[PDB]
C-alpha cells in the first residue's frame, strides 16, 4: 500500500549540451565575461561514478566555436588591406644579414594612395618570404593577395591568452573527473561538481601544447582509439619542458596611410644585424621527457617494441612546423631537432630554427586571412611545453611524428576532465505517505 | 554536503538536502550566451514549478499524493529504495513510467480532487 | 496610497499595502529592455523561491515557528510596529537577515515537511 510521493530538488542529472558562458578574473573579449567566484566551490561527490568521453565532449566544439567567433569580432572593426594588393618591386635585403637569413626578408616598394585620394606616392616595406609570391623577375605579390580578404589586426588588441573559465547556466552543472589515471574515456570513480571549469588559456599552437595543465602523477597517453593509426594521440606531461623562443631583431614599424583614420603597419627596417628567430629547449630535459613518453607508449604497443620519433611527414606549414603566437608575432619553428630519436627496448640545449610570417590563415578558412602587425623591438617568450600531439605511422618499430592543425585537440587536452550535465530536481518515488 | 553532495547517498539520506539543490536552480560574444543561459535557467525552473502546480504540490519540496504506487512501475520494497538505492539509480529504474505517473498525478489529483474540494466546501 | 506610498508609514500601517508593492515587481533600446525584463523575472523568482522553501508560497504575510531572538533586536512590538518604518527596521536587522533566513529554511520546511510526511500515515 504505497503512494507516489513527489520530491523536488533530488540530486539527479543527465548528460546535456547547453550554452556555457565565460568568467574571468583583447581578442578573447575577457572584459565581457562575468567575474569569477573568489572562493570557488568544488564539491566532491562520494560514491558517484560517472562515464566520461573526452572525444565526445560537446564543450570542445563549443569552445572552438567561441574562439573563432571572438577572433572574428576582434578583427571585424580593423583595417582592411585590400589597397595593398598591388604589384610589389622587391629586392633582397643584404644589410648585416647572416647566412641563415639570406633571402628571408625582401625590401619591397609599391605605389600606394597617399593621404589624399587623388595623388599616389611610392612607399616601401620589408616582407618575409613566406608572405611574398612571385607574379611570374623581381615582380612580386602578397601570398593569397587576390584569393582572400586580408584583414590587419588592430595593434591595440592583445593576442595574449587569458584563462577563460566556462560556467554553466543555473540548473546545469559541470562534473570534473579527479581520477589522476583517467585516460579520457570510461568510468571515473572520483567525480566532483564544479560550477565552472578552471581557467583554460586559449593557447593556439601545433605539435607542442604550450602552457596549460600538467599530469598529476605520470605522463598520460590519450587517444580515441590507440589501435587506429589515423587518430591523434594527446600526450600530457607530468612536468613542463621549458622552451625559450626569440625574435632577435630590433624591428621598427612604419605607418603607411590607407585612408582616412587608418594605417597599414609595415615592418619598417631592422636596427643592428639581422638574425634568425629560434627556440631553445634543454637537451637533457627534453630527452628525459621523451624517455617518460616512451615508457608510457610501451604499455599499448608492447614492452619489446622500439619507439621512434621523427619529424612531420608534410602538409601545411602550420602543421609541419610548431606554430605559435609569441607576443603577437607568429613563429613557425622546425621541430625536427626534437623528434629525431630511436628508443631501444633495452647543461646543453636544442635550438629549433624558426621562420616568421605576417599573413596567416587561422582555422583554415577560405577567403579570410589576417595580417599580423609588426611588433617593435626584440621578442622573447618563455613557455611551458605541457604535452604533445602525436600520430603513428602504423604501416617491431612504431614511428611517432608530431601533428596538429585541428585546434579542438588543444582545447580537448584541457576539457578532457569536464562534462556538462543538466539537473533534474523533480522526481517521484513510493512512500507510505497519502494526501 | 553542498550542491549534489548527496548524489551518491541513498534516496532516504538524500531527501533531507532538497533545498541544497533547489537553491542552485535559479543562480556580442559572451553577451548573447549570458542572456540565453539566463532565459534557459528561468524556463526550466518554471517548467518544474508548473508541474508542481498542476499536481497540487506548489510551494512544497516533498509532496504526498492520492495516486497509489503500481507494482508494475517497481516491485521493490521501501528498504530497497530509500535505504539501499540512490536517486540516480532510481531515475534509471523509473524512466519508462515517468510520463504515466505524471499523467496520473495530473488527472487523479488536483483535478478530480479540486472538484471534490469544490463540492465539499459547498456545504 | 500607491506604490511605495506607505514607505514613510509605520511598519503596522505599511503592512496593509503589501499587494501594492507586490503587484509592481513584474510590471540600443532593444537589448536593454530584454535584459531589464529578464532581470525583473530573475529577482522575482529568487524571492518566490525563498518564500517557497520557507513554507510561505502564495502568501504576503506568513507566520512561522521560528522564535524571535532578542539578540537580533530587543525592541518590543510597540517600538517596531507603531513607532518604526520598514526602512528603519531593514537597516536595524540587516546583519541578522541571513541568520533568520537560514533558520526559516531549516525549521519551516526541512523539519516541518518531514513531520507532515509522517503525520500522513499516523
Amino acid at each position, epitope marked *: 500500500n504505497l503512494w507516489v510521493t513527489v520530491y523536488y530538488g533530488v540530486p539527479v542529472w543527465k548528460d546535456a549540451e547547453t550554452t556555457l558562458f565565460c568568467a574571468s578574473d583583447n581578442v578573447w573579449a575577457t572584459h565581457a565575461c562575468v567575474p569569477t567566484d573568489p572562493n570557488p566551490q568544488e564539491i566532491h561527490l562520494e560514491n558517484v561514478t560517472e562515464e566520461f568521453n573526452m572525444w565526445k565532449n560537446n564543450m570542445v566544439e563549443q569552445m572552438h566555436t567561441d574562439i573563432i567567433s571572438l577572433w572574428d569580432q576582434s578583427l571585424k572593426p580593423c583595417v582592411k588591406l585590400t589597397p595593398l594588393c598591388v604589384t610589389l618591386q622587391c629586392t633582397n635585403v643584404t644589410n648585416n644579414i647572416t647566412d641563415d637569413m639570406r633571402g628571408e626578408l625582401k625590401n619591397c616598394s609599391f605605389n600606394m594612395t597617399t593621404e589624399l585620394r587623388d595623388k599616389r606616392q611610392k612607399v616601401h616595406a620589408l616582407f618575409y618570404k613566406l608572405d611574398i609570391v612571385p607574379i611570374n623577375n623581381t615582380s612580386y605579390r602578397l601570398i593569397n593577395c587576390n584569393t582572400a580578404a586580408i584583414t590587419q589586426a588592430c595593434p591595440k588588441v592583445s593576442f595574449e591568452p587569458i584563462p577563460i573559465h566556462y560556467c554553466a547556466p543555473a540548473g546545469f552543472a559541470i562534473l570534473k573527473c579527479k581520477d589522476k589515471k583517467f585516460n579520457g574515456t570510461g568510468p571515473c570513480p572520483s567525480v566532483s561538481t564544479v560550477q565552472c571549469t578552471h581557467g583554460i588559456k586559449p593557447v593556439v599552437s601545433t605539435q607542442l601544447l604550450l602552457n596549460g595543465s600538467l599530469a598529476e602523477e605520470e605522463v598520460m597517453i590519450r587517444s580515441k582509439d590507440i589501435r587506429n593509426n589515423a587518430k591523434n594521440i594527446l600526450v600530457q606531461f607530468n612536468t613542463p619542458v621549458q622552451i625559450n623562443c626569440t625574435r632577435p631583431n630590433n624591428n621598427t614599424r612604419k605607418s603607411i596611410r590607407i585612408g582616412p583614420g587608418q594605417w597599414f603597419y609595415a615592418t619598417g627596417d631592422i636596427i643592428g644585424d639581422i638574425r634568425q628567430a629560434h627556440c631553445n629547449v634543454s637537451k637533457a630535459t627534453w630527452n628525459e621527457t621523451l624517455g617518460k613518453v616512451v615508457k608510457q607508449l610501451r604499455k599499448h604497443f608492447g614492452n619489446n617494441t622500439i619507439i621512434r620519433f621523427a619529424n612531420s611527414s608534410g602538409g601545411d606549414l602550420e602543421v609541419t612546423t610548431h606554430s605559435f603566437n609569441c607576443g603577437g608575432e607568429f613563429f613557425y619553428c622546425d621541430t625536427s631537432g626534437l623528434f629525431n630519436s630511436t628508443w631501444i627496448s633495452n647543461n646543453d640545449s636544442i635550438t629549433l630554427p624558426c621562420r616568421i610570417k605576417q599573413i596567416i590563415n587561422m582555422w583554415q578558412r577560405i577567403g579570410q586571412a589576417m595580417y599580423a602587425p609588426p611588433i617593435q623591438g626584440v621578442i622573447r617568450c618563455v613557455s611551458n611545453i605541457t604535452g604533445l600531439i602525436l600520430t603513428r605511422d602504423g604501416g617491431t618499430t612504431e614511428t611517432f611524428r608530431p601533428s596538429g592543425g585541428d585546434m579542438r585537440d588543444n582545447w580537448r587536452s584541457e576539457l578532457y576532465k569536464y562534462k556538462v550535465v543538466k539537473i533534474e530536481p523533480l522526481g517521484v518515488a513510493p512512500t*507510505r505517505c497519502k494526501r | 554536503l553542498g550542491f549534489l553532495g548527496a548524489a551518491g547517498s541513498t534516496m532516504g539520506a538524500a*531527501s533531507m538536502t532538497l533545498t541544497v539543490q533547489a537553491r542552485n536552480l535559479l543562480s556580442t560574444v559572451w553577451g548573447i550566451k549570458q542572456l540565453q543561459a539566463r532565459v534557459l535557467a528561468v524556463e526550466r525552473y518554471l517548467r518544474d514549478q508548473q508541474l508542481l502546480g498542476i499536481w497540487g504540490c506548489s510551494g512544497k519540496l516533498i509532496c504526498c499524493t492520492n495516486v497509489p504506487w503500481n507494482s508494475s512501475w517497481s516491485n521493490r520494497n521501501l528498504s530497497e529504495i*530509500w535505504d539501499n538505492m540512490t536517486w540516480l539509480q532510481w531515475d534509471k529504474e523509473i524512466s519508462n513510467y515517468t510520463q504515466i505517473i505524471y499523467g496520473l498525478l495530473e488527472e487523479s489529483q488536483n483535478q478530480q480532487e479540486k472538484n471534490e474540494q469544490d463540492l465539499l466546501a459547498l456545504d | 496610497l500607491g506604490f511605495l506610498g506607505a514607505a514613510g508609514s509605520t511598519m503596522g500601517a505599511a503592512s496593509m499595502t503589501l499587494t501594492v508593492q507586490a503587484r509592481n515587481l513584474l510590471s540600443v533600446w532593444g537589448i536593454k529592455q530584454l535584459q531589464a525584463r529578464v532581470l525583473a523575472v530573475e529577482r522575482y523568482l529568487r524571492d518566490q523561491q525563498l518564500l517557497g522553501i520557507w513554507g510561505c508560497s502564495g502568501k504576503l504575510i506568513c507566520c512561522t515557528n521560528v522564535p524571535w531572538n532578542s539578540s537580533w533586536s530587543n525592541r518590543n512590538l510597540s517600538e517596531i510596529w507603531d513607532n518604526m518604518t520598514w526602512l528603519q527596521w531593514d537597516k536595524e536587522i540587516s546583519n541578522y537577515t541571513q541568520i533568520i533566513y537560514g533558520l526559516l529554511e531549516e525549521s519551516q520546511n526541512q523539519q516541518e515537511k518531514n513531520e507532515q*510526511d*509522517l503525520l500522513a*500515515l499516523d
Partner: nanobody, 123 residues
Framework: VQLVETGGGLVQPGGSLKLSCRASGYTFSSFAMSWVRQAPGKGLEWVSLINDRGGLTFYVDSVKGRFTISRDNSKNTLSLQMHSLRDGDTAVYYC??????????????????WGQGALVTVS
C-alpha cells in the same frame, strides 16, 4: 538489543517524576519509541509514542495534558516526564521500541523490543 529504564519508583500524589531509558544494540535514531504501562493487577496499556526524530509525540487521552515524552538521539536516551501523578498511574512502565515508522520505512505498528520496566508507585 538492550533497553534499560533508569527512572524513579516512588512519588507522592500530585508530585512529578522523570523516567529515563537507555538503549543499545541498534541505531537509536532509526526507531520510534513508546512507553507502555501495566498496573500491578492489570494488563498492558499504551501511554505514549515518539517518532524516530523526536518531533512528533502522541499520548493516551488519560495522560495527554500531564505527560511529556522526549528523546535525545545523541545520547541514545528516551525519557518520560510525568507531572501531577495520580493513584491510577501506579504501574510498570516499559520503554518499548516501535509503534510507528517514517514514510520511507516499513510500517512498525507493533512493539518489537521491551525491557526492565520501571515500577512507579503513587502514594
Amino acid at each position: 538489543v538492550q533497553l534499560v529504564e533508569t527512572g524513579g519508583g516512588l512519588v507522592q500524589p500530585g508530585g512529578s517524576l522523570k523516567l529515563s531509558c537507555r538503549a543499545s544494540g541498534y541505531t537509536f535514531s532509526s526507531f520510534a519509541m513508546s512507553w507502555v504501562r501495566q498496573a500491578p493487577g492489570k494488563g498492558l496499556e499504551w501511554v505514549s509514542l515518539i517518532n524516530d526524530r523526536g518531533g512528533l509525540t502522541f499520548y493516551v487521552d488519560s495522560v495527554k495534558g500531564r505527560f511529556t515524552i522526549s528523546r535525545d538521539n545523541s545520547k541514545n536516551t528516551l525519557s518520560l516526564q510525568m507531572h501531577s501523578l495520580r493513584d491510577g498511574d501506579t504501574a510498570v512502565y516499559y520503554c518499548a521500541t516501535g509503534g510507528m515508522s517514517s514514510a520511507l520505512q516499513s510500517s512498525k505498528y507493533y512493539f518489537d523490543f521491551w525491557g526492565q520496566g520501571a515500577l512507579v508507585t503513587v502514594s
